[PDB]
């Protein structure tokens, strides 16, 4: 198969990788393997260092400087390749040994091992006035040579490659999420029943979403409007908990319910970025430099460990609301609306052989 490589502006260094995407099965992560080409003849520092870093580069608002973004590291691990440390004895993968054979005796291998329970590749959608780098969580690998770790690094004496950490939808689905609500009033003891149910908790991006709803009206009021929506829930862990929501698509039904009568119907919604381009700050999946990606796929945490995961955690919900006519003794003072929330999960199916690539119809 073919591989990826890049050289320093000096041309002395070149690094080779098998891929840019790394699958995490939550419990374990695929090891990151690679080989670097070195030129010790002109290299007087006698030491070579590579680093994989998980940092939260972020833009700054109060600083009037355009383009300046602050970067907060979350996980940094570095391994030295040259000189070959006798302690860092590791086996080489099937491709890694072939690459060593091809390049020869002037190439050295390396391997990082990411600990689990770490944030995935996520990107925040930039505003129309944004000209800096991307905002979100992104991995990168930096390779360089220096006499000491604390030595000042040169731009010609380092490289930077971006990699992505994504998940895939598990094969075994769970039960169908169904939710019901019951509202009671003061004038009469007749309850207000509501049922909501989706087709299956697992969907693919761009597929229609169908929900089953049933209404049992028993009071003397009349239902005016029914609001159906799905919103994006974003959990942010930088210094504290940050909670906010943003709808992706809303549908309004003009159904009316007579007092002491029932109703049932099914509706369909579809999320897509085309009509939500102007909605600033939306969560999007990993980007390399500027490639247009889908909406951020749902992140699956590691069971109920109750861990306080750093970075960004994404989730989705289904919101159904009922508009109830006002008036009477309380007039327009009460709040008689009824609502319900349905969570669900959305990822990508497991790829067979072809990894996703960068905007196939290039212009």
């Amino acid at each position, epitope marked *: 198969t*073919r591989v990826f490589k890049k050289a320093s502006p000096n041309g002395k260094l070149t690094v080779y990788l098998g891929k840019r995407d790394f699958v995490d099965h939550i419990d374990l992560v695929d090891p990151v393997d690679g080989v670097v080409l070195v030129d010790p003849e002109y290299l007087k520092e006698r030491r070579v260092y590579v680093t994989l870093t998980c940092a939260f580069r972020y833009g700054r608002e109060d600083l009037d400087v355009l383009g300046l973004t602050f970067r907060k590291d979350l996980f940094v691990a570095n391994v030295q390749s040259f000189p070959p440390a006798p302690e860092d004895k590791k086996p080489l993968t099937r491709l890694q040994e072939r690459l060593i054979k091809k390049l020869g005796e002037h190439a050295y291998p390396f391997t990082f091992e990411i600990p689990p329970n770490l944030p995935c590749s996520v990107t925040l959608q930039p505003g129309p006035e944004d000209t800096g780098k991307a905002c979100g969580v992104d991995y990168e690998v930096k390779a360089f040579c220096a006499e000491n770790l604390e030595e000042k690094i040169h731009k010609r004496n380092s490289v930077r490659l971006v990699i992505r950490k994504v998940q895939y939808a598990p094969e075994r689905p769970g039960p169908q999420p169904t939710a019901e609500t019951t509202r009671q009033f003061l004038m009469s003891d007749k309850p207000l029943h509501l049922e909501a149910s989706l087709d299956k908790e697992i969907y*693919y*991006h*761009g*597929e*229609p979403i169908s929900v089953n709803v049933h209404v049992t009206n028993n009071t003397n009021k009349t239902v005016k409007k029914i609001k159906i929506s799905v919103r994006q829930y974003a959990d942010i862990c930088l210094f504290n908990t940050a909670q906010y929501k943003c709808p992706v698509a809303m549908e309004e039904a003009d159904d009316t319910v007579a007092p002491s009568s029932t109703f049932c119907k099914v509706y369909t919604l*579809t999320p*897509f*970025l*085309a009509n939500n381009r102007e909605k600033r700050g939306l969560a999007l999946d990993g980007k390399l430099k500027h490639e*247009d990606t*889908n909406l951020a796929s749902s992140t699956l945490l590691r069971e109920g460990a109750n861990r306080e995961i750093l970075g960004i955690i994404v989730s989705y919900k289904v919101k159904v609301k009922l508009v109830v006519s006002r008036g009477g003794l309380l007039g327009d003072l009460a709040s008689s609306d009824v609502a319900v929330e349905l969570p669900f999960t959305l990822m*990508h199916p497991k790829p067979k*052989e*072809e990894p*996703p*690539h960068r905007e*196939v*119809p*290039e*212009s």
Partner: antibody, heavy 119, light 109 residues
């Protein structure tokens, strides 16, 4: 999964026509639709494409300014706009469907329709 | 930018069971974003290989392909009687989508 097209015919040069591509078994939000032509005795040739998710439109240079594409999400059917037709543009037209996540070639093809542009 | 592909040879004839090959060239680097199609006379084209190396589902294994730099190759091991049709090489890296001329395959007499 069956792709059906209709609307071809014989029209005098410079006119317009309606090409509707009726897709079944799948939605348009998850697929990208493309149009390809092949002149009699010639090879195939892509003319247009549409992207429902990204809302992006692409057209060939030879057919720029005179051709437009459209799609209706209500019933998974797309319409093709052509104006100021040329006699040389007569060919056999095909509507095709491709996976949007991701591009893997043109697996699904229509039955093909014949258009004649002559006075 | 536009990409021009020249398929060679234009056409050939061969007997049943022969090993035949075709060459697909590129005007620029195209990586492996290349596919192939076969069209029977009077019908819609049929996809055979995508990514220049990956067979489609449900295809006989006699079909085969290869890649070598800017030159791409598709090869057939055994010629079944129904394999006599027209074939095309297609790349999908840069717009516009530019098709080739095509090769007609016919029996030998």
């Amino acid at each position: 999964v069956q792709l059906v097209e209709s609307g071809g015919g014989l029209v005098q040069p410079g006119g317009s026509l309606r090409l509707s591509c009726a897709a079944s078994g799948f939605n348009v939000y998850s697929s990208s639709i493309h149009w390809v032509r092949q002149a009699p005795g010639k090879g195939l040739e892509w003319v247009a494409s549409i992207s429902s998710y990204y809302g992006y439109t692409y057209y060939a240079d030879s057919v720029k300014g005179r051709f437009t594409i459209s799609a209706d999400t209500s019933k998974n059917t797309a319409y093709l706009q052509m104006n100021s037709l040329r006699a040389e543009d007569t060919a056999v037209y095909y509507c095709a469907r491709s996976r949007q996540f991701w591009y893997s070639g043109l697996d699904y093809w229509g039955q093909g329709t014949l258009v004649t542009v002559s006075s | 930018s536009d990409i021009q592909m020249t398929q060679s040879p234009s056409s050939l004839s061969a007997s049943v069971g022969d090993r035949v090959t075709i060459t697909c060239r590129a005007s620029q680097s195209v990586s492996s974003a290349v596919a192939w199609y076969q069209q029977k006379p009077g019908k819609a084209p049929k996809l055979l290989i995508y990514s220049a190396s990956s067979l489609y589902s449900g295809v006989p294994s006699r079909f085969s392909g290869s890649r070598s730099g800017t030159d791409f190759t598709l090869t057939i091991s055994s010629l079944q009687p129904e394999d006599f049709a027209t074939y095309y090489c297609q790349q999908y890296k840069y717009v516009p989508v530019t098709f080739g001329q095509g090769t007609k395959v016919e029996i030998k007499r």
